Design a protein around this ligand. Sequence first.
Ligand code: ADP
Ligand code: ADP
Ligand code: ADP
Lengths: 367, 367, 367
Amino acid sequence: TTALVCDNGSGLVKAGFAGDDAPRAVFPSIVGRPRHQGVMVGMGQKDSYVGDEAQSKRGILTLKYPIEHGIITNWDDMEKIWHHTFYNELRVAPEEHPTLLTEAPLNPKANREKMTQIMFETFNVPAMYVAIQAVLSLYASGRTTGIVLDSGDGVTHNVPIYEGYALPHAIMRLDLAGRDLTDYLMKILTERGYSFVTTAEREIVRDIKEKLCYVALDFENEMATAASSSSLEKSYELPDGQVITIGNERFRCPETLFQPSFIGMESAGIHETTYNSIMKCDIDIRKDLYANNVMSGGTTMYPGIADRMQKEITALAPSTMKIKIIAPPERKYSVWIGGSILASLSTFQQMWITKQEYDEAGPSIVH
Amino acid sequence: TTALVCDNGSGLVKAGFAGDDAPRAVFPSIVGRPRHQGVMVGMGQKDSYVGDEAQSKRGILTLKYPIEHGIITNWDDMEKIWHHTFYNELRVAPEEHPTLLTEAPLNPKANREKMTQIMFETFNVPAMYVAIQAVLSLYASGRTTGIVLDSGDGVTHNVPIYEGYALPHAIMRLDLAGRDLTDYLMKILTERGYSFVTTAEREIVRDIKEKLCYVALDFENEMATAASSSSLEKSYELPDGQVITIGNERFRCPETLFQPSFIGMESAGIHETTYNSIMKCDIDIRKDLYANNVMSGGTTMYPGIADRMQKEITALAPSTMKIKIIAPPERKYSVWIGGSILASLSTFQQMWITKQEYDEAGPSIVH
Amino acid sequence: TTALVCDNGSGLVKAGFAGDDAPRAVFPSIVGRPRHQGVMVGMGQKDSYVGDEAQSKRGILTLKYPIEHGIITNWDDMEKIWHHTFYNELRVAPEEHPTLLTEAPLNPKANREKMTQIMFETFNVPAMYVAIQAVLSLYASGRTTGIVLDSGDGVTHNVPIYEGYALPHAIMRLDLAGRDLTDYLMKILTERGYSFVTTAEREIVRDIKEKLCYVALDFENEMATAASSSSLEKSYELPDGQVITIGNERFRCPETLFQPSFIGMESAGIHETTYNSIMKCDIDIRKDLYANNVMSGGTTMYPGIADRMQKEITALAPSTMKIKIIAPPERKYSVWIGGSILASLSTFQQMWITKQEYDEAGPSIVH
Ligand SMILES: Nc1ncnc2c1ncn2[C@@H]1O[C@H](COP(=O)(O)OP(=O)(O)O)[C@@H](O)[C@H]1O
Ligand SMILES: Nc1ncnc2c1ncn2[C@@H]1O[C@H](COP(=O)(O)OP(=O)(O)O)[C@@H](O)[C@H]1O
Ligand SMILES: Nc1ncnc2c1ncn2[C@@H]1O[C@H](COP(=O)(O)OP(=O)(O)O)[C@@H](O)[C@H]1O
């Protein structure tokens, strides 16, 4: 009876036992299906492939991310990767111990109900509970106060927290980064004549975004530092072995986070939406928030993301006030680290909802 | 009730029981007819001669290959050699056990319908099935993934296969090699004043192509190695006993496979049509294909065919990617070996189409 | 000094003066070369043949389309047909008046730079400008708002436009139809035993696609209306005079536009990619787009293309919303009609880029 904690994070899905610095299974969430006729009468093949099992054989497969923007669109597949994650990958019987379940702040409640559902009547679990993406970033980072920033592939949001008292009216969820950053990248790369568009190749694109993006850090002279002289163009061999040439859009793709007029969806931009989240907070409360903003999203490894937020957030706010963006490298597992902390420790053991409670009222109880 | 598996391969036709490393009957497909007046009132003679029965007595006979380019032009004769192959040669009653039937990838379906037909209403067979030339080369070679190359006398084609999921849109059939290689050879040999043109002598020509051709392997200095100094000219006694002198065209005849501007039919050439087949495949899928291309056609014994493909395919593709052309000597029976494997093993026993199915819908069901 | 407007459209290339309902030169874009030895010592022959000059004598020639998918792969030939189009065909000095130049929405900018280049230093032109395939379809159709659909031989794309404010993030370019539709047709016709594969004969195939294709319009019962009873099979005499039999694939070839699992390249299909373009547009903006979608591609004359889009687009979208697909017959010249409108009218006269501007900064200015 030890806690295992899993996440919905689209992208990679991450699950492991309580009391550990990293989950035992980290694999992308995909339900793949063959788009071609079976020749191998060898029925050793499968209906569909999930995770790395699918991620290994790609161009053959078609790829469906079940987690759209934090909301989960397709349930039938989604239960499979859970059905997998409990059995293969990390190998556990479905009934041992409860599970803390990561989940999105502002998403529709109908998300978490069917999800609490299929954690019971299909395969019964010794209770359950569902926390929020951000609230576990502090249990991980150990802070009590402070605003967060979370992105990941599922959705980008920030949840200012002070002494474990949330400020829900200030929670700002703008859906961006994540997948939507590649879909701009597949869009932009055609500048150099690379036509990448198919469901299976998309990840080949992503592994560019992984390797070289960073953040422009005042990309005015940066484009001119790209345009005029070329020192920053790097080449990336791709699974066939052919060279790719880049560097005008290397920084330019993540730059869209600060000007979503590149991607075309017009809302805010991520740097000041934290500010425009702070301003909605109280006058008193905000002094330390500027110092404590953690920015652990799981997207942002960009070498110089934090460095530009420093520049941009100081351009906002009164300059007399010290702002500190902590960028711990152990993030991208952070939201999971909180699980292996929160559920591991106690005073939470009565915060689970047992199958009783689901028999008590119903799925509506989690709210 | 044991499976016997036969092929359409024009050229030699090959048939034998399941579970064997080589068919029991390998004989060329010809329906011969006498072109002269019968003197022997001895009616012990026949209407027509088939296979080696014909191949023994040639200049007397006229030779008609019923299998044109994989497509079978003449049915009336074609059923005879089948009518033979079941009775004489390998001696079996027409009704014992089903038969797997080899057949061409891109050929018109009207090919395989009349062929499935005459496997029923004329002589009834306990079910049936028709596979593809290439798909059985992997069951033989044991590979699962990998692109093929098949030529034979019937037609040349390549069918990239990955985990027994075919890539039909990438199947490249260019009709070449086979018979059409001799018809260039009978064309080229007149260089030395050998006028070979008659239907019966054509095979005398072929037995040169059998013995000495190889492949030029960068035949730029090769022609100059032919022209300038003569070390490579070899002589071949022919059924009368007269010497033949060759060697400028020894390599030059199969060389046409890489430049079908010698034969005059302009399409591609065989080396890069595999490449131009690969490129049509997916970006991901293609890494291993370059390593796995089997080139088992039944034509290609040419000592140094594989050696030049190595040279030519590396001249294509990104050089950072390892390409491996496997050239197993057991080929030329390969496409049959697959039959004695596939049909021998099980999960295929329900993949036959019983005479029921032909009574169910009709010949259209095989598709 | 009157405007002449030309297009890149692969396929046919179309050019003519401003202020006209149709270009003065409509001829296919090919640079042909003889694949055989010259016998006529008569040097009256040429290095290469372009356009109809080539299109007249085909089997002799080899055919290279310089415009691949909107992108132009071969420049050296491409300048010839321009070099022709200015001199022969429409007969004009290279220096009279600027030229509006049609061009693809999402193609790499390196396309249009070398193209703006060779409009200056090789032959100098009184300024220049390059518009987009779609944006001129409204100036032709006279609409201001509305989404388009464009295909042609070069590439298929749709560019929703509202009050002359483009929605670039919603521009959906999937490369399909055009040439790639024949290459499936040459692939499919072998069903009936017609082996058409050579570079010169390809157009013989195309002239079938011209004559009889239409669109299946719910081709479920249609195939059964083909299979079961044969009323729709039509015959086409080909340049030798021999009959062709068709009709199972008559509708089936353009049908691939709605299911590119026939051609094998898996992306979307053209009917809903407009929908999946609309959905990416704003909630407000989309009411009228459904009414205004023009579908002028230059491919689509298919008798019943618009009729099935009606069926399919209504199957998508809320049914409470009126959708109207206008299919003006004057299209296929439409993208050119816009030129003879846009450039003819004024407020555009300062939108040209004079040779000054190219001397100002360089080719990078067009962006
Ligand atoms: N080094 C990196 N550079 C840029 N982007 C990255 C990097 N590492 C991960 N990402 C992006 O961040 C995502 C993290 O996904 P994940 O953390 O599972 O989402 P969530 O936070 O919703 O769980 C990856 O899928 C990838 O798209
Ligand atoms: N050693 C060799 N060298 C050159 N050509 C050969 C050699 N052996 C066979 N061939 C050619 O390859 C053909 C193989 O025919 P076959 O395998 O029956 O065609 P298919 O593959 O369609 O069944 C022979 O008919 C002959 O023309
Ligand atoms: N009546 C028709 N039926 C089917 N296809 C057609 C018909 N007319 C033209 N096409 C196809 O549409 C193409 C139009 O080419 P074009 O308009 O020059 O391309 P672009 O739009 O890029 O300029 C032709 O080359 C032909 O392939």
